[PDB]
Amino acid sequence: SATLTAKNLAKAYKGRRVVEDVSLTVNSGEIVGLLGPNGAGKTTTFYMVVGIVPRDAGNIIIDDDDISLLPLHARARRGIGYLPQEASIFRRLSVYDNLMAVLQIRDDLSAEQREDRANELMEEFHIEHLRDSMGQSLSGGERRRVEIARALAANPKFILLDQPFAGVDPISVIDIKRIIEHLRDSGLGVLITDHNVRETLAVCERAYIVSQGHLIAHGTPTEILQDEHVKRVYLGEDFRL
Ligand SMILES: Nc1ncnc2c1ncn2[C@@H]1O[C@H](COP(=O)(O)OP(=O)(O)OP(=O)(O)O)[C@@H](O)[C@H]1O
Ligand code: NA
């Protein structure tokens, strides 16, 4: 029953406070959403949890252990993983090599197990037919599947998915949701942000809504979708699920 908690995170860039105050929690076995308008601070919040950027204030805690001082690699070894929003594939490496590149980092895997895991990931994500294709040759949706698989290959306890559905077709969204639910069933805590509101809320048990660097709402999917404030500020007053 691990718990990942962020308290009162803040970030400024060149005097502009882009994250004012964001707190959130994700438990093992739980899928949690972070949603909101563009420029609201979602990726910056993920960056601060993962350790990609230093926070200007706030705390990152796993269980009753403040890890705010741990560098990126140490937080990764404590169980935090991140799927970047931006392209993260190795352009010149094949799909197989891209997955092996991450599996090589796994102290908890033998050489034989790494090869097995690579082949399993390719089947689960339906990219076996692209085994030898270079990353730069993949379409956007194909690349995204590889990038999600790479993030899972790290075997995180808490996985932060930054826009896993971007550029993905509807059937592949269903496949990825099913994979996400299997991670949840397996004990992972999942923190997901995406602008496909319907499909993200369908897979979330609860979600935080941020706007202009601050939280404006938190609740179950239906509580969010019927929140008239969220409709006005984020979903649009005429939003239909
Ligand atoms: N390195 C930076 N320097 C200055 N400003 C930045 C920097 N990075 C981000 N910003 C600004 O911080 C604000 C929040 O950025 P962030 O990417 O975290 O928001 P977001 O919620 O993820 O947006 P989106 O939904 O469009 O992806 C933005 O307005 C951005 O212009
Ligand atoms: Na973003």
Numbering used by the authors: 1 to 241
The authors write:
The LptB2FGC exporter is an essential ABC transporter that assembles lipopolysaccharides (LPS) on the surface of Gram-negative bacteria to form a permeability barrier against many antibiotics. LptB2FGC extracts newly synthesized LPS molecules from the inner membrane and powers their transport across the periplasm and through the outer membrane. Like other ABC transporters, LptB2FGC contains two nucleotide-binding domains (NBDs; LptB2) that function as a single ATPase that interacts with and powers two transmembrane domains (TMDs; LptF and LptG), which transport the LPS substrate. Here, we discovered a novel C-terminal domain (CTD) in LptB that is crucial for LPS transport in Escherichia coli.
The new structure resembled that of LptBE163Q-EHis8, except that it included a fully resolved CTD. The CTD is located at the LptB dimer interface below the ATP-binding sites, and it consists of a short helix (residues V230 to L235) followed by a turn and a loop (residues G236 to L241). Within each LptB monomer, CTD-helix residue Y234 interacts with Walker-A invariant residue G36 and residue P37. In addition, CTD-helix residue L235 forms van der Waal interactions with CTD-loop residue F239. The new ATP-bound structure also revealed a functional interaction between the carboxylate of CTD-loop residue L241, which is the last residue of LptB, and residue R198 from both monomers. Residue R198 is located in the switch helix that follows the switch motif (or H loop).
